[PDB]
Each structure stands twice: as C-alpha cells, then as structure tokens.
Amino acid sequence: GPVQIDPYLEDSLCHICSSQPGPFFCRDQVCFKYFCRSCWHWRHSMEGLRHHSPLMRNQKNRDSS
Numbered sequence: 001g002p003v004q005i006d007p008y009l010e011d012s013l014c015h016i017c018s019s020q021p022g023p024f025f026c027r028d029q030v031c032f033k034y035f036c037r038s039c040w041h042w043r044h045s046m047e048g049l050r051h052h053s054p055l056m057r058n059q060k061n062r063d064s065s
C-alpha cells in the first residue's frame with residue numbers, strides 16, 4: 001500500500017503554537033508528540049531534554065541495513 005501514518009499517533013496538533021501538527025516526532029517518554037521547527041527548539045532548550053532528537057513521522061522505509 002501507499003505511505004501513511006499509524007493510528008496510535010495520527011495528526012496530533014502542536015499544543016505549543018496551536019497552529020498545526022508538527023513534521024518532527026519525539027519518541028521520548030517526556031514528549032511523545034510532534035513539534036514545529038521553532039516549537040521543537042523551544043521545547044528541547046530546557047536542560048534534562050537536551051538528549052532528545054527530531055525523528056520522521058512513522059517509517060520512512062519498510063526495510064534497510
């Protein structure tokens with residue numbers, strides 16, 4: 001089938017700006033939500049979350065090395 005997102009996350013709206021869903025995903029137990037470029041920088045600036053990293057939404061590839 002075609003590329004698509006999982007129903008366990010869906011298009012969750014960015015609660016920081018309240019404008020739209022973010023392109024970057026955070027899998028950390030602290031976040032577990034999407035953020036925009038500016039909202040992501042604001043969220044992860046605080047110490048204790050500086051180990052986080054922006055991921056793609058769902059799998060960008062079914063299988064790889």
Ligand SMILES: [Zn+2]
Pocket residue numbers: 026028030031032043044049052053
């Ligand atoms: Zn995070």
Ligand SMILES: [Zn+2]
Pocket residue numbers: 014015016017018019020022035036039
């Ligand atoms: Zn945002």
